Symmetry: D3
Subunit: 332 residues, 6 copies
């Protein structure tokens, strides 16, 4: 089967309007909540939106059997004020994801957002983590830049600021899925910021003692590791002057395959190996456009991996299902 | 013939000491200048330092015939105060490079730093550009982040803030070589910051009308374009609703080959083509370490390109000399 | 006839979702626009949602014949960045109000938001004003605090920073309707901030030369003037050594009747007179809760005014009808 | 008897000069202190200065028997630096009020300033409170905005930041009299800022648990509650889904009658009742200008209340006398 | 005769209370003004205040025939907001000084404050200068730090920011009397800040081209030049490496003698000469305390100068009257 | 015997280059260290540079037998970021000084810099103080302005912020030598800033209870106490209402004689007495210029003190050796 480890929820429009209202009244109306029926939640999974077809229909067309769906990260407003609206919105998105996966369990598997508020101790996400565990969530999006490309930044991922979360994630045996959210920069919009933040996050993890202190910590880096597999040589070289090689820490990391060129997919898999690659596509999303020279949708990338002749059938099964099943603790 | 388009000056210690002193008295002692003889400058290009051998000796070992040497970018302190020390130090570095190229002209071709001060109009670098042109300089390092990963940032490269510079570069028919400088971030040290800034600079140039307005502008992006050749699919996808595709603007750009894995070199060349790649190594530098699996230096990357069977001899001559001769206007 | 001069649009949920997305991609996806059908715009004006009933049904239940609808002010994010999303959202709201009034012209009359970006010169709202004039809009919400209770504030309304806008309003002979937007304060939420800002705006206009320099400028102050009619004595007292008395400039202002107690409505009308009061209710909205004493919504305030013995039937026609017709340039319609 | 619960000290010029010098040397000359004789303190309460007549003569002309005098709030510079000059000045003002009330006890009753420094924990005012208690003070001015309309603001009055103060006030059984101080805004000068801050403070207290947690806390809101009695409807409406209604917490508050129009006084008393209104005038001060319609000062508001037919003579005794006696713990004196 | 060029007004207490009220209402009451009778103004000149005797009586006791009285600088609040209160207060102080000198012309000569608002162009003081000229004022206190030891500072005195004032002062042929005002520092209170600011101001004037561009500019530096005459050697030495000697610019400057030790007075006069020293005492003020070992008031410093045996009678006449008569254009 | 208590290390260029590099990579390269041989260090102490002769040769010319050498304060960058480079650079300077004193022990006695980081608790310099004590250091430079004339300042020296340091200094019975470092001001360059900071530091110490609480604390104020001996009268006057007089606290302080005019040297010695003056010259440095009226170097000031007829031979021995032997605990 094909399990896509990187999708984002197709939600009723009510969800995004709830965000706008929270921001407008800043909590003066209280928490309230998203009011949508089960029927509206299902309808949202079939609605075209800005894509060539509905979310469910696209996954069928591409041969994807199941997809792990998480919040749309660019909406999660981790730098917004007041803090409570960040928490409330994150909670409502997760609840909506839970409902949709309960209504469409044949296709969608829930992955949670963390209510990271820029500057708050990381322990402030633990209550929502626990609620999500109880709801059957299988992982958590981890944002290395809750400041959303502002004047300030958070500590690097090797900093002890993050250690309470790594400890909890190991206790749960659930993964962190590195994913930045928004960007306040006119130079780097959010879709580019994703990549730069994946690069910084991966670099931090491969030049610190995180995996010495948390040998079982499971981290999936989005978008084939940002720049890292392409730029690995220079960071490996610089690490020869140091304690442990960059590559020896990088070996601990998982990477998803959200890359829309064959050459990039080849380099990722040849660099980190089929044992550390999880098929993911972000479909529907950024890549849901047609190449006019081939007619293929750019985020229909499973065929590239199926056709790679340097991979065995066993390797392909790792990438398409077994790694996700292990990393996200998916049961038969 | 092998021409290495990306090297940084091996300078006598007196240069870096001049920087320290300038920062310490902030101009209260006057501009002054670096006081250093020629034997001292030559010695710098032969001194082993932390590398396995001297700068000249390494280039000989690797079969490099000539190298374009520019300032060491991480020393150029474009965010430092007061502004006059940034100008003065850049001018003194350019002068030292000129001396070293004159003293050792069988090897070194001069490329200039620009005295970019965070927040200053770009026209403030023109006087130095003119001086360097008079001295036979063949290009300029262009820093997209003179704020050096500070609380503020400069406008994106498509912003008219930069148009005066593109104008001058087209008048001179000389190239800009994209290279960031330092980084004030605890999360992103300068060696990582280089790559993220190349990604942003390239993204900005490929999603703006720069090459529509300056069809003849010559830009070389360092380090194989940051993340861009690896992450091209997602940015091409997003551009399909736009005046021009990301790839159509990217086709105007040149890239150097400062990449220390074979797979990354292959992906760069397959992505942009031999007609847009310039051999570069940054030797000596972060790559000047021994890969004990081979005994070879990591930045000795010419053999990788020489052994790619998908490239013709003509394609290899483009990468190793012809593109650089054209882009940097090198005379036989 | 009863014309309600203070209502805010009941918009399809797509409009607010559009705002959330603009803020999320910060305009990196381009301007785009709200994608809603005529059917969705009409349904929204009848949808029950947070109130006891739909927007149009409540106006029918209350005997309101027409209502001037403007943007929902607390959504207009005048302090948000980048500036372009403030402009774009304001334009989309105005376009949607035009469509809803076009689709339901027996009920709704269009009043425009201004794309006020904190810190920008006021002339940056003129292009959108001209577009709204072309679309038939009859007035403009004017926000004295586009900084939305932030660390900084705009100049007072008497400052020459605003004079270009007053000039244009006089050229058009169209009113400004004073209305603050959101509030970044934890002490002062937006529904309270409205009142305080109305008080400041009114105070500025009555202690400056605006009406000396723009005698025909038409200004309607929301919510019965914030605190001013109640606190008028202290401001009048301190004005006695100035060019004109506070009351002499205040006589130029119009005031809407969005007040939900009988005693406050009585004080408003006795203070400024029926010649300067425009019936307004903000229904549906803050006042859309059942008053236990009457079994009716608190924003069903028309009967209080109709039953005031100290007003003539002509006075009541001014409040319910004639003043809005004059101030908002309403032609013979229905 | 008529007790005016809202007056501010008429101090010798030396007190204000002392403030200027503290600010100038920023405490580098040490704390020092105001140097004034008993004679200078007495003369100041009779000096004409900016008003039509002396402080005591006006109270006699108006038939006020006694007045509770507190600091002049707009001089108390709660946002000034360094913090020590705020404390020192507050202490000197309180000492001077004690002396003036000691020297003229048939006229003046002491009410204290709190040395609120923007950003300091509220417990830093406790030492001075204890000293004022020892000196016979009968209440405390409480400033909800010690930041004085700056870039920052204090927590709302419902925040636990203030709970230590409410506890102490209940221990002492003495009231807080809500009063803002100066304002750094060019839009909102201090006389207007007073009103807006009273509105926020009242709103905070009526939408929080303060009176649930401190049922015997005594709070008097200056200037008839800012905007609140006039704007009560909208706040009541939005409170219907909360622990208690806005009006249910508002019933705990007392309000002074510093309002200079008859219609506003009528609305105040009809809204909160005579059981919660304390006569106050702020004479001499903002209202100390001749009302042309009466030939009397605008702050001569006692006759308006005395002539309200809808109040019993007992009601008027509550407003003029009994409420202040209960709230400020005034014993049988004169 | 003895003319004391450095005194500060003994004003009715109403003046300082007016400042407190301006600050309290921030102009919301309008400008208003100080309301005091001629009799109150005279009384203030006879009142002891915090001193051993009244202002007039002290000058009589010390043998001072006339004194130039200026605003009390530590009250002038040049960093206060809003700007208009700085201007209004300065104007009221100057008007009060004018009235007192008109009422007591046998003793007091008027010197004006400038309404310098931190950050305002210096041209904003010219209107008050003109009013003061019309009132017969004979000089102006010049504050080199209107920011009053804040986070920011004004340009050095050689900066062209100040050139419009130097031009006006030469047009009027009236002097600037360097005097700082308040200090927002817990480390340097105002009485120490005076000295440091005199040092900086003098240094700026002796290391710039001010006296080349304004050869006739008359500047009296308060308190014997801060640190400069004592520290002159090091600044002279450093200037030998430069254009003009520190001493050659310093020769253009006048200095008052507000120094309360004999040794300091000797050093000042031996360093700059009797031709550039103007007797001043600041009496009543900081020095109006009794030395318990001699019973002499510390600011009774004329006898020290009268008794110096290295000065001729002509020199002493320069210091005690002739220099002030020339510098402040005092007519017989 | 002449002991010069105020000299700054003549260091090989490699030291200042190490500073530049540290600032450039901000620790991303590791702490590293200065790499320099002994011939290079000796050569530094003999190299002419910009002076009329080498450091050692000048001291011989002037009759100075030994000099206490400390860091060059204007290089110590106490306001620089990140904090670790301030610590590392201070440590490397102290190590180099130790090497040079060991290599040239007939001349140089070691005095340490403190790794003061603006805003850090003073206890953060104790580890380095201990290390320097173990290495035989005889004193410490104390910077009252680690913020280097920035927007913020440190607490005054009487503040308990500094009491831990005074405690340690009394435990070690070692002195603090007051010396500011750099200055970020365009108005006050560092050579002027030194003097203003000495004035403030001395004022703070003489108007606080430091010497009441640490009667044995040894403090040497550079440059003859800034302005203080010249401006003493006004500060004594203001102190007559205080627990102790300014002069009574000032009597505990020592002053070095780095003053380059005869009159200033005389005023210092007459003001504080021979028992509190330590000969110092800062040679070579800002005073190493030829006064062409004599041909003598401005910082050759020993002859002035030798020829003062108001001092006994015993008084001169105090100034030239005995006070320094006692204050810096020098062994015979
Ligand atoms: Cl509203
Ligand atoms: Cl009041
Ligand atoms: Zn994603
Ligand atoms: Zn490079
Ligand atoms: Zn409204
Ligand atoms: Zn009051
Ligand atoms: Zn003075
Ligand atoms: Zn030194």
């Amino acid at each position: 089967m094909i399990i896509d480890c990187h999708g984002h929820v197709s939600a009723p429009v009510e969800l995004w309007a709830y965000k706008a209202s929270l921001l407008a009244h800043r909590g003066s109306h209280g928490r309230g909540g998203v009011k949508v029926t089960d029927e509206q939640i299902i309808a949202a999974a079939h609605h075209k939106e800005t894509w060539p077809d509905g979310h469910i229909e696209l996954l069928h067309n591409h041969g994807t059997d199941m997809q792990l769906i998480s919040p749309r990260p660019f909406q999660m407003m981790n730098s917004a004020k007041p803090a409570r609206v960040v928490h409330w919105f994150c909670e409502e998105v997760n609840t909506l994801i839970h409902r949709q996966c309960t209504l469409i369990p044949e296709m969608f598997i829930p992955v949670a957002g963390l209510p990271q508020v820029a500057g708050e101790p990381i322990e402030n996400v633990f209550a929502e983590m626990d609620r999500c565990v109880s709801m059957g969530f299988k992982g958590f999006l981890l944002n290395p830049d809750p400041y959303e490309n502002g004047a300030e930044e958070a500590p690097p991922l090797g900093d002890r600021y993050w250690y309470p979360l790594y400890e909890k994630l190991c206790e749960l045996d659930l993964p962190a899925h590195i994913h930045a959210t928004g960007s306040q920069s006119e130079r780097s919009p959010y879709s580019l910021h994703f990549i730069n933040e994946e690069t910084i996050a991966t670099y931090n993890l491969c030049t610190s003692s995180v995996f010495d202190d948390f040998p079982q910590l499971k981290v999936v880096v989005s978008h084939g590791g940002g720049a890292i597999p392409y730029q690995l040589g220079r960071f490996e070289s610089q690490s020869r002057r140091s304690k442990h090689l960059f590559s020896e820490r990088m070996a601990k990391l998982y990477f998803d395959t959200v890359l829309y060129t064959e050459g990039a997919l080849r380099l990722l898999i040849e660099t980190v190996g089929p044992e550390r690659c999880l098929f993911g596509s972000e479909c529907p999303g950024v890549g849901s456009t047609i190449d006019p020279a081939t007619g293929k949708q750019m985020d229909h990338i499973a065929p590239f991996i199926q056709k790679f002749d340097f991979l065995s059938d066993a390797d392909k099964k790792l990438i398409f299902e077994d790694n996700a099943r292990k990393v996200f603790n998916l049961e038969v």
